[PDB]
């Protein structure tokens, strides 16, 4: 589909068996989701942006369903104010910016 940017590009995704609203974010290197449990191993990481850094848990090889497409990637879990779908996952569904 073609998403205009008049409003925040929010989409519904399926991760860890639950539905969540997320923001499609070309300005993000890695996906960040609010606190939730995920299977497998993880390692601590610090990610920063406007306002500073937050500590998150990094899980690799996680399956995320987005717009019918099933993509696999890294997911950071921590105290983020908004769920963000980053380039790490956007590349897998072939998302591109056009103008």
Q: Which residues are catalytic?
A: 25
Least Cβ distance, residue 27 to a copy of itself (angstroms): 3
Out of 29, 35, 60, 65, the only residue in the binding site for ligand 017 (CB under 6 A) is 29
CB contact set of 66 (below 8 Å; sequence gap of 6+): 11, 13, 14, 22, 85, 89, 93
Q: Is 44 in the site for Cl ion (CB under 5 A)?
A: yes
Rounded Cα distance, 59 and 43, in Å: 7
Out of 27, 40, 41, 44, the only residue in the binding site for a copy of itself (CB under 8 A) is 27
Q: Is 32 in the site for ligand 017 (CB under 6 A)?
A: yes
H helix intervals, 24-70? none
End-to-end CA distance of the chain: 15
Return the one option of Cl ion, Na ion, a copy of itself, none that residue 68 interacts with (CB less than 5 to 8 A, by type): none
């Amino acid at each position: 589909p073609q998403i205009t940017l008049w409003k925040r590009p929010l989409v519904t995704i399926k991760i860890g068996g639950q539905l969540k609203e997320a923001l499609l974010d070309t300005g993000a290197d890695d996906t960040v989701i609010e606190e939730m449990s995920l299977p497998g191993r993880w390692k601590p990481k610090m990610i920063g942006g406007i306002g500073g850094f937050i500590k998150v848990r990094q899980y690799d090889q996680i399956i995320i369903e987005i717009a019918g497409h099933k993509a696999i990637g890294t997911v950071l879990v921590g105290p983020t104010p908004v769920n963000i779908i980053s380039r790490n996952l956007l590349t897998q569904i072939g998302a591109t910016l056009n103008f």
